[PDB]
């Protein structure tokens, strides 16, 4: 009954995880050669990356 | 471009391992499978 007003702070811990962002259309592993990997072949063009 | 006939040569896309090997080697590794397996040498495509 003597508690003081408080503010909640959250966080999370990740390790041995190595965030990944797959190059598929729906971020889904429907195959090793992703859906967009083939489209870049047929398009046959160059694109930088930032 | 005709599946880029270098992915096919490198098995990035194309015929599966059980298919481009000569029938007779896949048959061989099929029999002597319990001992001295050959499955993990040849790789096969998994195109989406």
């Amino acid at each position: 009954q003597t508690a003081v007003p408080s503010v909640t702070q959250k966080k999370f811990l990740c390790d041995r995880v190595m965030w990944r962002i797959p190059f598929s259309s729906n971020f889904m592993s429907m195959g090793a050669l992703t859906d967009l990997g083939q489209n870049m072949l047929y398009a046959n063009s160059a694109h930088a990356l930032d | 471009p005709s599946m880029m006939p270098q992915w096919a040569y490198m098995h990035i896309a194309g015929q599966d391992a059980s298919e481009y090997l000569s029938p007779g080697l896949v048959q061989f590794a099929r029999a002597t499978d319990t001992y001295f397996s050959l499955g993990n040498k040849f790789r096969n495509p998994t195109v989406a």
Binding site: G31 | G14, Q15, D16, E19, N44, A48
Partner: peptide, 30 residues
Amino acid sequence: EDINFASLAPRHGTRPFMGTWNEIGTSQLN
């Protein structure tokens, strides 16, 4: 035209890798 459309079936090699008959919906606590 009256062409017939099959299904795409993500490919493990040349074969389309269809799959088995797994349209099973039985849980049945028993």
